[PDB]
Amino acid sequence: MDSEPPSEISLKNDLEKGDVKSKTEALKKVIIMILNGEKLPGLLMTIIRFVLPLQDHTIKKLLLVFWEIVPKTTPDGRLLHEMILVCDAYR
């Protein structure tokens, strides 16, 4: 997904699927559309839900990636708190 700004409905579906690869790919697809500068908050609860505690680095690294380029803007699955869904289980 080079740059496709309407694809956020499919990404939500792909983000949790019971297959780790699909989830990683989805979250990756979100990153590439934001970096170009395209739509991203719809997904947030889905994105945040699988990855949170785990020591399994790749999804964690992917989520960690998305928190330095848009964390502030996206708020469906995060909202505003001191120990946000950016860092609460990332302790």
């Binding site: 949790e16 609860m45 889905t46 945040i48 839900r49 949170l52 505690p53 699955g77 909202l79 708190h81 120990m83 946000i84 869904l85 609460d88 289980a89 302790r91």
Partner: protein, 159 residues
């Protein structure tokens, strides 16, 4: 079947989960995070998300709401100071659109303790009678003995 089990810290959520999964009473630590496990009961495989109840984590439950078929809300029946707080958490949880049709099962837990509030008392304090929009049930439990646990899984499976 997808299940979200929450409640305030120390209610007994992880004790319940691992009693169900291992038939064992484990020595818990506060859960900073979740535990997720699959349990077989009578041809149903329940995937239970036990999400820690301390404040930081409490702020995160909303990410586990979506796709939830049923909600186990664990209450420490012996703690009277925090029952109002439980009531407050649970009431706005009931207002959550992703939790809209999910089956609501309250566990009044630590029923084994001498001064534990009764399930009826808890039902009045949590305002359970006022839920008309979906299925609810309250069940007295003791997670250490295992009492009431499977009666819960039973009720849940009949959603």
């Amino acid at each position: 079947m997808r299940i979200l089990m929450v409640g305030l810290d120390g209610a007994g959520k992880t004790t319940v989960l691992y009693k169900l999964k291992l038939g064992e009473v484990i020595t818990t630590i506060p859960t900073i995070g979740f535990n997720v496990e699959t349990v077989q009961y009578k041809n149903i495989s329940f995937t239970v998300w036990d999400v820690g109840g301390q404040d930081r984590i409490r702020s995160l439950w909303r990410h586990y709401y979506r796709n939830t078929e049923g909600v186990i809300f664990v209450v420490d029946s012996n703690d009277r100071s925090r029952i109002g707080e439980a009531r407050e958490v649970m009431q706005r949880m009931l207002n959550e659109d992703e939790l809209r049709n999910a089956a609501w099962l309250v566990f009044a837990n630590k029923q084994d303790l001498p001064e534990a509030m009764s399930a009826a008392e808890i039902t009045e304090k949590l305002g359970l009678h006022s839920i008309r929009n979906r299925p609810w049930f309250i069940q007295a439990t003791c997670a250490t003995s295992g009492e009431g646990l499977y009666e819960g899984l039973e009720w849940l499976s009949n959603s």
